[PDB]
Amino acid sequence: MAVGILEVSLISGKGLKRSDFLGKIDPYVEIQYKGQTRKSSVAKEDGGRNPTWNDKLKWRAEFPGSGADYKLIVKVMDHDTFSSDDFIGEATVHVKELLEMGVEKGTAELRPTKYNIVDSDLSFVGELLIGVSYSLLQDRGMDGEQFGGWKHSNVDHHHHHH
């Protein structure tokens, strides 16, 4: 139950899905000097080659609705013996617990844990960076700086017999 703007880091991301022609035009950075700004749309299929400080993404968030207990979303990760180190990521999945905890003190931030983002049974998760926190605000600024990147591919196996 919190209404504010969300923050995302433009680290990396894999686009398992397609769209109406995906080239070097769709994936645009948020750069402007007038008044309004635009956030980079979905990933253009494996675009982690780019940095993270390149730019940030913001979106409007509103109170999801009192849940009153229920909904764990904390028991859907991997490697749980005491305290895992490696982390996978987080995708568009039931996680209002983060934005809802924001209104508590005015701001919220995901806890230090490897959330769920692997193809299993949640919401068709994929690949994303961890750190997307939520805070109470509505002053969508602009910021950003000119930049770009590129990509090709990356595949290989390990077979020395039949």
UniProtKB/Swiss-Prot annotation:
GO terms for biological process: defense response. It comes from the Eukaryota. Induction: Regulated by ARR2. Ca(2+) 1 binds at D20, D26, D78, D80. It holds the Pfam family C2. Ca(2+) 2 binds at D20, D78, D80, D86. Transmembrane segments: none annotated. Binds 3 Ca(2+) ions per C2 domain. SUPFAM superfamilies: C2 domain (Calcium/lipid-binding domain, CaLB). GO terms for molecular function: metal ion binding; RNA binding. Its cofactor is Ca(2+). Keywords: Calcium, Metal-binding, Plant defense, RNA-binding, Transport. Ca(2+) 3 binds at D80, S83, D86. Residues 1-108 form the C2 domain. The keyword Calcium applies. Binds to both sense and antisense RNA. Can also bind sheared DNA and dodecamer DNA with a low affinity. Interacts with mesophyll plasmodesmata to mediate its own cell-to-cell transport and potentiate RNA trafficking. May play a role in plant defense signaling. This is 16 kDa phloem protein 1. It comes from Arabidopsis thaliana. The gene is PP16-1.
